Amino acid sequence: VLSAADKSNVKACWGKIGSHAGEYGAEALERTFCSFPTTKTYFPHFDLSHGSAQVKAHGQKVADALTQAVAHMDDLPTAMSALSDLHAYKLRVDPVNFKFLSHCLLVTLACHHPAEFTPAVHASLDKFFSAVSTVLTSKYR
């Protein structure tokens, strides 16, 4: 459960990142497919090759939901309820795969935004990405 300090860290970091989120989603997805090949099992209908425009497109969708998550950190079960059904009942992604993407998102933000990636902000984004990952792993039964 996200504190007052966490929310200001996240929103302040998400602002600096700004319009770049979508490209960071892309690279975070690429890094997930690269570093953890088992995640690609969920995307057999994707052209997954390096620099592919379906991964770019998809990472922008992932980014979109996260920006929407940044605005709704007081009630995340409500604002991700469409994604929540998609991930826990529709497709059903094993929770470990979320740890993979979450980590790779931190990797991407550290590579792109070093001045922002402080110890305290690193901490708040972890908390925020797994609070998103928990909502997403919901409706299994």
Partner: protein, 145 residues
């Protein structure tokens, strides 16, 4: 069980690592990002804030030893279970660390590596270091009984 191309990415990037800084950085971030881990380091002093942990002399000095053991991992990448046998036993029998956290410290090291090298930390270079850190976490987890 690493390839030559992977060892190339790994050993190549590592020869440029700042053991003085990166060790202190990974351990500090572990205690900051994952506060439960602090319970294993009560002897180290003030860990009451990110500032406190990141300025802690004990965290920094122990963080150096951890990065030195990661250097040891690299030199012995073909025999991780062997190299990490004594340290596996220490963590199990003396420190009582759930081996789950090893993965956490491996991923923090990766982030600290990304933060230092920015865009030089390729997806390929990352993937290879992901392989190292999982290997090391696995070797330190082996002597648990």
């Amino acid at each position: 069980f690493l390839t030559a191309e992977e060892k190339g990415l790994v050993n190549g990037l590592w020869g440029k690592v700042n053991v003085d800084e990166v060790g202190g950085e990974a351990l500090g971030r572990l205690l900051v990002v994952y506060p439960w881990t602090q319970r294993f380091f009560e002897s180290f002093g003030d860990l009451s804030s990110a500032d406190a942990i990141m300025s802690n002399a004990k965290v920094k000095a122990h963080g150096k030893k951890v990065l030195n053991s990661f250097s040891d991992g690299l030199k012995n990448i073909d025999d991780l279970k062997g190299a990490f046998a004594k340290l596996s036993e220490l963590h199990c029998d003396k420190l009582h660390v759930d081996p789950e956290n090893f993965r956490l410290l491996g991923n923090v090291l990766v982030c600290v590596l990304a933060h230092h090298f920015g865009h030089d930390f390729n997806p390929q270079v990352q993937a290879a270091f992901q392989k190292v850190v999982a290997g090391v976490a696995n070797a330190l987890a082996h002597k648990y009984h």
